[PDB]
Amino acid sequence: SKSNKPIIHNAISHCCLAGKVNEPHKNSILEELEKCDANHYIILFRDAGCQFRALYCYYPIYKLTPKNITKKMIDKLYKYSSDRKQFNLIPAKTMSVSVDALTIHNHLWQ
Amino acid sequence: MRECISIHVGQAGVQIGNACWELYCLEHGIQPDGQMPDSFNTFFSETGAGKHVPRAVFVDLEPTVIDEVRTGTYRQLFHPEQLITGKEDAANNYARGHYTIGKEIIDLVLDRIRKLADQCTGLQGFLVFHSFGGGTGSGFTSLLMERLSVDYGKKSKLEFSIYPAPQVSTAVVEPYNSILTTHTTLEHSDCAFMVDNEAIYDICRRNLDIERPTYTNLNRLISQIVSSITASLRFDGALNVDLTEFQTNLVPYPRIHFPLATYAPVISAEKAYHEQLSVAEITNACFEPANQMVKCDPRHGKYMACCLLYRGDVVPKDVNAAIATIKTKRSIQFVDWCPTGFKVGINYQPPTVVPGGDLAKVQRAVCMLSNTTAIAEAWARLDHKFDLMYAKRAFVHWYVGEGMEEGEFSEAREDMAALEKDYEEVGVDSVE
Amino acid sequence: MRECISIHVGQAGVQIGNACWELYCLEHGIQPDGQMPDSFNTFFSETGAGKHVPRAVFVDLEPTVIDEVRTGTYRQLFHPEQLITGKEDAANNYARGHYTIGKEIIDLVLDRIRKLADQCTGLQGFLVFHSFGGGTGSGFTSLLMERLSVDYGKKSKLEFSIYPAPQVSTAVVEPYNSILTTHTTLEHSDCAFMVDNEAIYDICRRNLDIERPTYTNLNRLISQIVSSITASLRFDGALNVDLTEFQTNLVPYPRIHFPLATYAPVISAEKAYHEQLSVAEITNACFEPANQMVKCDPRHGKYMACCLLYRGDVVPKDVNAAIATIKTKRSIQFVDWCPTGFKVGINYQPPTVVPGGDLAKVQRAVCMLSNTTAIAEAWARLDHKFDLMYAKRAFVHWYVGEGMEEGEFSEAREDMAALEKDYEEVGVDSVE
Amino acid sequence: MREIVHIQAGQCGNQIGAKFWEVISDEHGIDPTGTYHGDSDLQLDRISVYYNEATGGKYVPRAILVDLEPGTMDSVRSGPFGQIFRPDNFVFGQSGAGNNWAKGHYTEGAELVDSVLDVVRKEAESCDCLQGFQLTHSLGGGTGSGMGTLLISKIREEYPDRIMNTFSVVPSPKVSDTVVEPYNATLSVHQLVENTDETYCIDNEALYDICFRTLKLTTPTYGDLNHLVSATMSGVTTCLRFPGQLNADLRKLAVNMVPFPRLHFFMPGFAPLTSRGSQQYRALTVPELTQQVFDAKNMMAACDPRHGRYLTVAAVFRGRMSMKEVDEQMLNVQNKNSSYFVEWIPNNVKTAVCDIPPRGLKMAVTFIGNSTAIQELFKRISEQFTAMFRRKAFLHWYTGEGMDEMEFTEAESNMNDLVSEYQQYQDATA
Amino acid sequence: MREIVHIQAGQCGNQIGAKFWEVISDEHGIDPTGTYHGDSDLQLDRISVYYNEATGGKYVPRAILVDLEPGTMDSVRSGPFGQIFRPDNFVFGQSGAGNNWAKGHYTEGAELVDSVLDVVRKEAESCDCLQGFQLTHSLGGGTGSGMGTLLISKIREEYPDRIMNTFSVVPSPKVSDTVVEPYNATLSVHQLVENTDETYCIDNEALYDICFRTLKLTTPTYGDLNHLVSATMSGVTTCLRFPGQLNADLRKLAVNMVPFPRLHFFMPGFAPLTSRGSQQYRALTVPELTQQVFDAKNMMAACDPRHGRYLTVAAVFRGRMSMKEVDEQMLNVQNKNSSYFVEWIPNNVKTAVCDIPPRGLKMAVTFIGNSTAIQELFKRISEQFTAMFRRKAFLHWYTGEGMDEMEFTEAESNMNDLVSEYQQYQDATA
Numbered sequence A: 001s002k003s004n005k006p007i008i009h010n011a012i013s014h015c016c017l018a019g020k021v022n023e024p025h026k027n028s029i030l031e032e033l034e035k036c037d038a039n040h041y042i043i044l045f046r047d048a049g050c051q052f053r054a055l056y057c058y059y060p061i062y063k064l065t066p067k068n069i070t071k072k073m074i075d076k077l078y079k080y081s082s083d084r085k086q087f088n089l090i091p092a093k094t095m096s097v098s099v100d101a102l103t104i105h106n107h108l109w110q
Numbered sequence B, C: 001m002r003e004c005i006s007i008h009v010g011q012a013g014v015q016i017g018n019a020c021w022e023l024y025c026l027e028h029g030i031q032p033d034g035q036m037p038d039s040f041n042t043f044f045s046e047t048g049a050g051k052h053v054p055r056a057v058f059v060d061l062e063p064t065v066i067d068e069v070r071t072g073t074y075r076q077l078f079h080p081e082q083l084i085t086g087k088e089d090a091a092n093n094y095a096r097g098h099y100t101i102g103k104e105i106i107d108l109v110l111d112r113i114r115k116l117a118d119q120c121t122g123l124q125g126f127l128v129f130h131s132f133g134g135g136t137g138s139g140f141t142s143l144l145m146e147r148l149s150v151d152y153g154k155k156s157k158l159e160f161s162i163y164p165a166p167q168v169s170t171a172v173v174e175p176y177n178s179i180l181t182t183h184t185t186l187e188h189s190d191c192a193f194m195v196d197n198e199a200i201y202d203i204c205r206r207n208l209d210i211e212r213p214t215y216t217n218l219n220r221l222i223s224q225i226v227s228s229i230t231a232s233l234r235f236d237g238a239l240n241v242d243l244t245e246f247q248t249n250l251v252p253y254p255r256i257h258f259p260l261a262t263y264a265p266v267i268s269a270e271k272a273y274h275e276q277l278s279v280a281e282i283t284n285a286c287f288e289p290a291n292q293m294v295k296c297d298p299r300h301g302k303y304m305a306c307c308l309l310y311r312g313d314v315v316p317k318d319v320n321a322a323i324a325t326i327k328t329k330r331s332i333q334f335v336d337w338c339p340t341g342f343k344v345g346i347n348y349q350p351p352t353v354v355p356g357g358d359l360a361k362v363q364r365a366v367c368m369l370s371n372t373t374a375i376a377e378a379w380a381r382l383d384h385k386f387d388l389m390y391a392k393r394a395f396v397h398w399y400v401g402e403g404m405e406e407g408e409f410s411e412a413r414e415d416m417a418a419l420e421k422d423y424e425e426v427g428v429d430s431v432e
Numbered sequence D, E: 001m002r003e004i005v006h007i008q009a010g011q012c013g014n015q016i017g018a019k020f021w022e023v024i025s026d027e028h029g030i031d032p033t034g035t036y037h038g039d040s041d042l043q044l045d046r047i048s049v050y051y052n053e054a055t056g057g058k059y060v061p062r063a064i065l066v067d068l069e070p071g072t073m074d075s076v077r078s079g080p081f082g083q084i085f086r087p088d089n090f091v092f093g094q095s096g097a098g099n100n101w102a103k104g105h106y107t108e109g110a111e112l113v114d115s116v117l118d119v120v121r122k123e124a125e126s127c128d129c130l131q132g133f134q135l136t137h138s139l140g141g142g143t144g145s146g147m148g149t150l151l152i153s154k155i156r157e158e159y160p161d162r163i164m165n166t167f168s169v170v171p172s173p174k175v176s177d178t179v180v181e182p183y184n185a186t187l188s189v190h191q192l193v194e195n196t197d198e199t200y201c202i203d204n205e206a207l208y209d210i211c212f213r214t215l216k217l218t219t220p221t222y223g224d225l226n227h228l229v230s231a232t233m234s235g236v237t238t239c240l241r242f243p244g245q246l247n248a249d250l251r252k253l254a255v256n257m258v259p260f261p262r263l264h265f266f267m268p269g270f271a272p273l274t275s276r277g278s279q280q281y282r283a284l285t286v287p288e289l290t291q292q293v294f295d296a297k298n299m300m301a302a303c304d305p306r307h308g309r310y311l312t313v314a315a316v317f318r319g320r321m322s323m324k325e326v327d328e329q330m331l332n333v334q335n336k337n338s339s340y341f342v343e344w345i346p347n348n349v350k351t352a353v354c355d356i357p358p359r360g361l362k363m364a365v366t367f368i369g370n371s372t373a374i375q376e377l378f379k380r381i382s383e384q385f386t387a388m389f390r391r392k393a394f395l396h397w398y399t400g401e402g403m404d405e406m407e408f409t410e411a412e413s414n415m416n417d418l419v420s421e422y423q424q425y426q427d428a429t430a
């Protein structure tokens, strides 16, 4: 029934990859989104400044482009408002349907 | 002392509570500023200066009905930290007040409660005011009742449900809310009062001689019911009652905990004369089928545990004589396994009339909280307002598209169809 | 007979110090002329006439912001020998405020300090007000802390370092100023206080109801934290603590000496009412993640040592009561090697308010100076704002061309990465 | 909060809008300049929902005005209540659609939609939290449907989770003001049942009979039709910006109303409707205003309510009144008309009571009806479509703009899907 | 202290400065005669940074005007604000460069620059502590391209450690206003990437469109383009001479900005940009002024910011405001635009807030951005150079003035070196 596929395509192609510098890089990930049937996609940044590095998906968590993650390595929760077109933070901590993106620890990158 | 705090979820809760905190300031000489020209420490926590503030968390997703509190007469009373607004309401959509929008601001709610439980050395219980109709009143209550009971567990939580009428409704998905806001808050709620709109419109017409009841007038009555359940904390009488004392008397089983209210005397100013309204006269104004403020037939079921809470000048001899007539009368029936099932209570304060209201200055009152069997057929009705809108699968496409499973609707009715037979478990007699 | 003196390096200090000595004159009746209509001799050395001059050496490479001091309200106060200006600024360049330009005027600075160490029979401490952001405040201090320590060695040297924010920065080479200016100060700093702008902007927004805070308004808050650390010299309460006493209580190791400050209560004129702000109420206002004036989550690390510099009418029974609550609470953690880690200080002065300000008139206050483990993650961040702007060798060419080696940057980082594990030295528990 | 961006397309909606903003200005005390002079503070308590406060204490309407030739815009900027708009927002082309649907969605729209959507994107960022996008157009013109169905195919991609209401003037049964308007409306329903949450089917033909019979008007100008449509257009969103006793808003007017994500074609009603001197003959009570509403002659859509059954009903009230009188009469007209209301929706009346009347009245009713009564409207146009396509007349003006016979059978298949689905949920009783 | 010497060269620069010193004299309250009549003492607190106070209380601008023919000077001296200059400093020749680069640097350059550098040597000695040498010329002429690249190769020898900003007008993509301006630029870029610390690349072509679209002008004269360029020209050094809350001078706007000793080409911007009547339609607050800056239509350089990425971005604000708004808005336009900003420069906004607005406004942003968006500006000119060198047309006016093919290949190799380095530090991610 429901999904998040029109939301993430609206979030990738218009917020963090909309510049024409990464326009070949946007096509290098857009064709890897049409070839999956996941009911819940999710985006993992590296910084609080939401630099895009990897695309994931959630089941009611595999690396579409760490491979698997748990509920311990999560720090912040981002919700992409289609109003402002900016990833807003989430006071809630449960990974749910409204949760559009998240961050992880700086231990995982050093 | 014995402190008790108040949460007003939804519009139907707050507009009652705008009249509720209009009413205790009448009973305690309190200015709208919080001034006044020491037993009342339970619904207040005063200042080092002379100013009392309530214990109120007026919480709402939409900002509209909140913004009239900050402009009304009672701006200068509430702490301006308390009144919680938000972006957009759930808008009669249960999957928005519990999953989408109420999930966002749930932590701002519980933390202001957290800064109110510290001031209370002897904290007693909660008074949540909500409906079953709206999306703010349903998804956000069942969100809130789950989180407070995990936080505390050992307190007393009292819902005040504006019950959905059998005949006169102002919503289209009002059966699709109530099965969700009873399944979820079945375990956490502890004594959920049912009050119906429809039977209040009768009592506005017949006993009050008013043909045009504004909601300014309907919520004076439910304010009088709330101001007499909690009349025994703010005042001391002869035979007092507490919020922990209700839940043992009125609730015979962990499932069935739905009392309903009845207040008396409800008469206009012109009919204050022409009768005398004795302590054994207003008691008969309770067990009629007329004044039962839920549209149910009390002669189509039994009373498990009635509960009388009088106030004003009542002499304790006369109650026992009044009760002894009633248990002998025939059409009034009690449950066979419950031998003698009353619970009296007398406070020393009369009800006081709000100026410009529509009740007479009476000398006594009674706020009956009876736990009948007659509400079972109304529970045998909202599933029939449920299934006719479910076999055609109508309106499912709004709940599903906001974070709700399709499989978690036949699960709720399965609990709700199980809740019907426990009322029928009451009516039978295990004959030896 | 106990005298402390103050230096104001860089722009960020001097603009703060314009509000500090604005605030000291409010607690003593000191005119802008130095007139007044005896324990305040700690920050003054008066003249044979009726005039007090402060113990302040305002130093700046750029001649700009000093000129507003010489024309401002406090023209008729400071000694014109104190106000040391210069020709050109370092201009956000550590290699200019330490090697090239600030090397020149350093003898004019140390000599005017030298003429203030002789008016003090009871010379106590230093106050270097500076930022980690600019080039003067980070370069000239690192020059100046080396020179006063070789001069004296045995005096307390408290800084007030503006910390660089994790999210909002008004400088581009700012992670190149900070990693240099901590390495240089680390042998010679004594107890370096941290303040961030970004965490004040929440406290300007939420607790104060100001959406437009000016640098008039941010520097009022950091002045009150300064005006309560130094309250136990100018006045006598029941429990006074000197600047020679902070360096032993707060500082567990010769490396880890970075407390972050917190002041409470901070509420507006309208929300000054509606609550009572007891000595057990304002204590819980300090240990929130909301009220920390450094943007670090304090629930991501343990408190090693706190220090609660109370003031106003605080009665010392309730402090022991309030602390006994806090050490028993769950989320607040103390370190397994520290048994109980507080240092209480009660003074007999209400925090007086500057007219034309935006804080309430309160009767008690608390200037928490709480060392922690939580600031270590921000040290795991400024090295990551460092390595990305250095693996591509950006911005090196302004520091090479002003007397700095290439190798003396990676020498600082590995010394700074060694400071990271010394907090991980704290976080472990050497069991058995 | 809950702001709304107002987009005006076609020749129809701009002349609607030029009277629409003439209506909203008198509810808030707004001069032609843009400043406040009203007498109630509630006019400014929610003034931000259609406005932006400019410097000096002026207000500008949040309204984007779309055309493809400067003919309509020149009339608006000349007239009163027309200079109040922002001159950046007048996004218009030059070449003219020429009442050609394929020209205003493929040819002329593809060079003007870019300079619309940035002006769209400018207005959205100046809001607190956005609620919806109200559009005002036809289903018969080329500009009001080619540019009309283009934006929702672009704005819903920019905004997947807001509400989109189109106040589409629907072609009439009797008079046909365009020879090819069966070809336009069949291509408009294909791009309104897929992307909009609700659609306000208003006709021209039954709009005169309300003017002639009930109102007793001699000469109905369009300045009296759009005068009347603007009443419903503002009456829906007076419960979002004024404190009612029982509040509704544009999301509450979606979940109450629409049982299936295709069947969302509404049809309004308004009351009181008097004459210049015949106001003495009646009383203004809620039992009177209710029975004026449910007549056959007050539904502005040109279809008989009795030929078919209702599903959901939202009678948004205005003015200061009581609540039982509402709740009695809404019950009263369901018991005597339970054959007209369908079986499988019990308590199918959404009451909404506000507290502010229209300017100068005492009360008002803004009915919103959702019925099976427009199954024959989509049996009307889809029959006018088919005979004009078996001979395929007027086809070389659409094929020449890049369009095939393959597309024209899909929209005919799409609308005949909608014929069966009103038919399916009309008699399905259990 | 911190005094700045102002050299002007070429026909272009000698008319910008006549508007530039027309601009400054209203900020400090200076008559055409040279005396003070203003109202604020802050006007005279730093009057000595562009002036010398002569006898009688007269002030004279520290400005040196250079030309090779007396045509442009005679316009300046006859006009207002022309007699205020020192008449010794009008150092000019008589031959005229004739829009010829090889004539104004090799032939006529050596016969006049001796009389220039002595005047430079005279003006520096009347200062307390010298700051820098701001300069105004083009990259298409013969005088402003040849005399200006002569001076900096001489003045840097006289001053190895002062800052050198040139406000160079850059040739346009569409209209080739000079037949051989692809030859003037590449010979001038050879002497700006090796001596100057910052070079303010301003185009004509994007400067016209702002006069048409945003400003709504019908007849844009050069007296309304240089009027606009001078607003940026004073906005950079209004923080060096006025007490700001966050002070920035010409050295702070060097080390914050310039990441590498070659990539130092800036492209400015300005806000607000109203119209004569459209000022009533907006709000003059920092959330508007920020988003007016980062449009494609506010960059005065003829290039798209969306093509290419930024590295470091300055924003010098004027007028009394608050710091949180600016700290919010500068934060805001990086999170929604994280694609446009480069990764390996975090916190890539430099901010400056001064306390004095422009004369008559409330607030104003003077933008200074650095980008990879000018790789194609040096891919445009480096291609117009190449096709005009294969057939080597228009060469016998340069070879005749002592110049070889050796120079025309090195400068072509010099500029394609810079094409690689805006490419090297654009995709280098880590």
Ligand SMILES: CC(=O)O[C@H]1C(=O)[C@@]2(C)[C@H]([C@H](OC(=O)c3ccccc3)[C@]3(O)C[C@H](OC(=O)[C@H](O)[C@@H](NC(=O)c4ccccc4)c4ccccc4)C(C)=C1C3(C)C)[C@]1(OC(C)=O)CO[C@@H]1C[C@@H]2O
Pocket (backbone or CB within 6 Å): D022, D023, D026, D224, D227, D228, D230, D231, D232, D234, D235, D272, D273, D274, D275, D276, D279, D358, D359, D360, D361
């Ligand atoms: C002295 C006095 O009370 O005069 C009334 C009046 O006499 C009557 C007859 C009015 C009048 O309406 C008409 O004559 C009419 C003409 C053409 C089409 C429709 C109506 C009135 O013009 C219309 C007008 O309505 C309003 O002012 C509302 O705010 C209305 N505004 C407009 O329609 C409007 C008209 C011109 C310019 C701008 C706006 C409105 C209604 C719904 C939503 C928003 C606004 C009213 C009460 C009056 C007059 C002046 C005579 C009536 O209509 C309305 C819409 O109120 C017709 O029956 C009602 C009953 C009113 O009593």
Ligand SMILES: Nc1nc2c(ncn2[C@@H]2O[C@H](COP(=O)(O)OP(=O)(O)OP(=O)(O)O)[C@@H](O)[C@H]2O)c(=O)[nH]1
Pocket (backbone or CB within 6 Å): B009, B010, B011, B012, B013, B015, B016, B089, B090, B091, B092, B093, B130, B131, B132, B133, B134, B135, B136, B137, B138, B162, B163, B164, B170, B171, B197, B215, B218, B219, D245, D246, D247
């Ligand atoms: N007694 C009483 N009932 C009221 C009042 N206002 C509304 N109601 C009832 O509230 C029910 C509708 O649900 P509400 O609780 O008001 O809606 P909500 O909780 O605000 O949630 P939303 O859907 O988000 O608006 C109906 O049964 C109304 O009769 C009032 O003033 N008094």
Ligand SMILES: Nc1nc2c(ncn2[C@@H]2O[C@H](COP(=O)(O)OP(=O)(O)OP(=O)(O)O)[C@@H](O)[C@H]2O)c(=O)[nH]1
Pocket (backbone or CB within 6 Å): C009, C010, C011, C012, C013, C015, C016, C062, C089, C090, C091, C092, C093, C131, C133, C134, C135, C136, C137, C138, C162, C170, C197, C215, C218, C219, E245, E246, E247, E252
């Ligand atoms: N709290 C606060 N911070 C300030 C104030 N003024 C400047 N700052 C901060 O100071 C930092 C920059 O340091 P500066 O002192 O201005 O620079 P500098 O050391 O003087 O050296 P220059 O680069 O030569 O000006 C930034 O992070 C500013 O936010 C102020 O009034 N209050």
Ligand SMILES: Nc1nc2c(ncn2[C@@H]2O[C@H](COP(=O)(O)OP(=O)(O)O)[C@@H](O)[C@H]2O)c(=O)[nH]1
Pocket (backbone or CB within 6 Å): D009, D010, D011, D012, D013, D015, D016, D097, D099, D100, D138, D140, D141, D142, D143, D144, D145, D169, D171, D177, D204, D222, D225, D226
């Ligand atoms: N209600 C109303 N209908 C109008 C008005 N103007 C035009 N129409 C109708 O709009 C239809 C013609 O469409 P139109 O919008 O002019 O063409 P377009 O400009 O290509 O969209 C016809 O059915 C007209 O009756 C008006 O002012 N009011």
Ligand SMILES: Nc1nc2c(ncn2[C@@H]2O[C@H](COP(=O)(O)OP(=O)(O)O)[C@@H](O)[C@H]2O)c(=O)[nH]1
Pocket (backbone or CB within 6 Å): E009, E010, E011, E012, E013, E015, E016, E097, E098, E099, E100, E138, E140, E141, E142, E143, E144, E145, E169, E171, E177, E178, E204, E222, E225, E226
């Ligand atoms: N902005 C601006 N550009 C000008 C002005 N005068 C000339 N130019 C430009 O300068 C270029 C011609 O160079 P010019 O300076 O006159 O030749 P030179 O005297 O040999 O340096 C062309 O690109 C003109 O557009 C002016 O007043 N303003």
Ligand SMILES: [Mg+2]
Pocket (backbone or CB within 6 Å): B010, B011, B062, B089, B091, B134, B135, B136, B137
């Ligand atoms: Mg609600």
Ligand SMILES: [Mg+2]
Pocket (backbone or CB within 6 Å): C010, C011, C062, C089, C134, C136, E247
């Ligand atoms: Mg400085």
